[PDB]
């Protein structure tokens, strides 16, 4: 019976309560103080233009109908008094498929302070949309946004604010990094007002600044392209009479460049513009095909006791073709990787 008191308190607090109406419906505007704790910034799907951010979505608002006087000022009740009372209908503007976790009990809490101040957190995984511009692939940087506002309630009814200072109101856990090929530099928040056909709504914007890491693409695409175009330079130091050897060099380097160009595009979406990796692969293809045309001209200028001599075309291309690759490769990384 030492519990009967709390049971009565809760029965008094739910007696005559209407949960279809926001608190201060007729006299004020319900302000909701929120703060996003990023438990772990999950993986970024570059094919789907989406990222996943598991969070502890905290909210807090004042409800004068839940004032009480009893032994404990703050009542850490269960997550089942959350459906009995009014809760804000916050939804994510750019979300796609979000899951409140239900195992084992539903992962929310509810704390009712004795002055009527409520705290209502929940754990969620929000797959959201991060429109990306891929002109500087694979050394691009992105700012994936996370917008959330009050569905159903207009700025004259429910407004949102950060419960701490806005630089400190989104906290990423030290171990919150499930990002494989990206690098979360930091987060910036904002607040705004969107206007729709139904009214003006307060939207809370959080941007997560990501920068891609070129470690997979250097090993997978850049280094095989460089080794293939160096392998095309090997055919210049051979003999003009080895026609099958040099055409085997030429056609195998051309086929290697085609299969690298095919196998470097499937990691990307089917966009309608050329990335920086495509501009590297195209110039490497030009330098491989130029080596093939070089051998074609050498073979056309091939005659065969007089004996055949080395080619002046091959003597210049032993020096110029490695040089003009190094001139291009010095200005490609300075243009893109520096800025």
């Amino acid at each position, epitope marked *: 019976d030492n519990t009967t008191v709390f049971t009565r308190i809760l029965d008094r607090l739910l007696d005559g309560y209407d949960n279809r109406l926001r608190p201060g419906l007729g006299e004020r505007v319900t302000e909701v103080k929120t703060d996003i704790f990023v438990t772990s910034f999950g993986p970024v799907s570059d094919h789907d233009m989406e990222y996943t951010i598991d969070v502890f979505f905290r909210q807090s608002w*004042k409800d004068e109908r839940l004032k009480f006087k009893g032994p404990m000022t703050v009542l850490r009740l269960n997550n089942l008094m959350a459906s009995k009372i009014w809760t804000p209908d916050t939804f994510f503007h750019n979300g796609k498929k979000s899951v409140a976790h239900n195992m084992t009990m539903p992962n929310k809490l509810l704390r009712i302070t004795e*002055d009527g*101040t409520l705290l209502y957190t929940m754990r969620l995984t929000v797959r959201a949309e991060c429109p990306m511009h891929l002109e500087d692939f694979p050394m691009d940087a992105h700012a994936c946004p996370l917008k959330f506002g009050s569905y159903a309630y207009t700025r004259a009814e429910v*407004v949102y*604010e*950060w419960t701490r*200072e*806005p*630089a400190r109101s989104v906290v990423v856990a030290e171990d919150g990094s499930r990002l494989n090929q990206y690098d979360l530099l930091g987060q*910036t*928040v*904002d*607040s*705004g007002i969107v206007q729709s056909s139904t009214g003006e709504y307060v939207v809370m*914007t959080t941007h997560f600044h990501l920068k891609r890491k070129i470690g997979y693409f250097v090993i997978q695409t850049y280094l095989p392209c460089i080794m293939t175009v160096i392998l095309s330079q090997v055919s210049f130091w051979l003999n003009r009479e080895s026609v099958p050897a040099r055409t085997v060099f030429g056609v195998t380097t051309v086929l290697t460049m085609t299969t690298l160009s095919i196998s470097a595009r499937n990691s990307l979406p089917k966009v309608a513009y050329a990335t920086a990796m495509d501009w590297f692969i195209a110039v490497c293809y030009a330098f491989v095909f130029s080596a093939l045309i070089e051998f074609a001209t050498v073979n056309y200028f091939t005659k065969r006791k007089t004996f055949n001599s080395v080619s002046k075309i091959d003597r210049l291309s032993r020096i110029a073709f490695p040089l003009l690759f190094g001139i291009f490769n010095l200005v490609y990384w300075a243009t893109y990787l520096n800025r």
Partner: antibody
Amino acid sequence: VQLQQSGAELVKPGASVKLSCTASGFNIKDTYMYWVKQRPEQGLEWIGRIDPANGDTKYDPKFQGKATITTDTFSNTAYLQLSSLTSEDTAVYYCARKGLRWAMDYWGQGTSVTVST
Amino acid sequence: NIVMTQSPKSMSMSVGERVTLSCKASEYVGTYVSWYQQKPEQSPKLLIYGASNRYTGVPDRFTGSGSATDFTLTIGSVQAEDLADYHCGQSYSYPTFGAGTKLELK
């Protein structure tokens, strides 16, 4: 609604001073308080804040160890606590509360402290 | 720490003309930039809370403008009651302020 502060006072250098800030029309449990250092013919400088629902105080690094922030729950007031005043510390002190977009909307009438002989 | 710089320091314009005014932040502040009305021997009064969002009880001639770094306060027509200095303050972090730009009439 109304923010009231203490009257202007005269203090010797090296002593201490306590300056009250009375707020009326609303409880302080839902909004933060801000105290602003305003030098004569100069811009505004922020000193510190308080959450009266928790007692948590954060300070400007250049005001660290100089001011201490105290709020009485029953008397609906907030009190300055300055320990080691210097002769330079002659300015006016402003009492403000957090508004709709983290902006100090309601301000007090101000109180000019003076350290002289 | 985020510092706020306001320019120009002062100007003397006639009653009824457009006056623009600039504030800038060292680091990113989203829209949390406030403007204040400091009449001499009175406390500051808020004019624009947030970036480009007018306060209640102020005239319509005060228009704010906001970005990530550049913030502009403009007055469409200055009257004789606007002889006061304006302060730019940020609130995305712990709050700081500018220097304050005075106004006067010829």
